[PDB]
Symmetry: C3
Subunit: 157 residues, 3 copies
Amino acid sequence: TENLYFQGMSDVIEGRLKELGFTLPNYVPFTISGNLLYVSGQLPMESGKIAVTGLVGRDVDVASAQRAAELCAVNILAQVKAALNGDLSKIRRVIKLNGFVASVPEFVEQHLVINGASNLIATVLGEPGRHARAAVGMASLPFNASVEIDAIVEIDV
Amino acid sequence: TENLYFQGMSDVIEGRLKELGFTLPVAANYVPFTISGNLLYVSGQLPMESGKIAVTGLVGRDVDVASAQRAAELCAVNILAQVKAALNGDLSKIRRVIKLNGFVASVPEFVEQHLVINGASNLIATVLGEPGRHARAAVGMASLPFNASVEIDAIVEID
Amino acid sequence: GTENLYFQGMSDVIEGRLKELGFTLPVANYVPFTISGNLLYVSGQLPMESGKIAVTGLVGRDVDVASAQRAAELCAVNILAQVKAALNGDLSKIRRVIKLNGFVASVPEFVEQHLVINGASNLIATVLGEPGRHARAAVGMASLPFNASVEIDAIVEI
């Protein structure tokens, strides 16, 4: 019964993500300590490729970087689902996102870029999706990703 | 009585901050802080003073170390304002400042980000005493939201 | 009793494995670490060797990947020294390295910060084994204190 409830809750979360246009795809993607889930920096992977590359303010505009952040967030959710054995309803609260945005020094709208991730997360999870955050401008990122985002998530354990 | 003691402890914290030259300010799908167990995660704070970003541009180009240190202090005061909010008015319910991440907008020749973040660290340790002493990272960023010179987030263990 | 000997043994093994990789452990209002519950937060460590910053400048300009990888190893060695201090001499009391944040001083064309931080990740996993496997971020910085090429912080369950 209550496992059907949690299955249902997970279905609703993943369905809301599909309504936004996304399906879920020596260091590890995540670790757990107590009831905190540490997710490694995720890149904007889509179909096994970095979807958005280069510097925001040079190679990529805010709208494209927002999609990058959305993809990072989708990849975070993918890892959380795997961490929780298929059940995104075992998320109690997204505690923190760290949003790293590859930026030229004149680009100062990293907060708008990371809004791509924050809005998607809050939209699919509701109130438990609302999180603390940092949004910062980086010189560059692995594989020339435009955005990398890590997460700390409080989970039902 | 315990409540009076805690109000007193908070008055002392905020009074120390005034002696340093600062009053606490009053200051979406992201929030200024979250709490998990007895850990308070405070979002990255910018050098806000009177609702304005007080120090902007790149350290080593637009701003020098002294100005950047003031920026770090302001970030720290904004952190303290969020913690006060989180603890319903009571900065005495801080058990330990666990970590600050100090992000300093830097030209690549600028390599004194530790000195910049010392602005925040010194202010926090002064106002809070031993419980203010924290782990830290200090790093140079290409740029920051609103062209802030410094942004600083925090994790604080609370009562 | 011998439970204490057992932990002493495990720490010997960890430090010995580190020496096999060619490193020994080295010996303010901010501190090198704090503890909350069973979580140890270690401050950003620089590539310190014999009291000096061993590797300086921007990866892709002043230093190549192999040199940066050695910086990242030194950062990890310094993380382990702090952890050893935090645990009163006992690296065996590490339960899990939860997270490393790897900050690499980078020119904007340099995009192999994952390979740089692999220096630290591989060393940590080697000397600690399974408990050394950690979550991670690897990012490119404009510059770092003292012109370090790499700075790394850590959260460790103890």
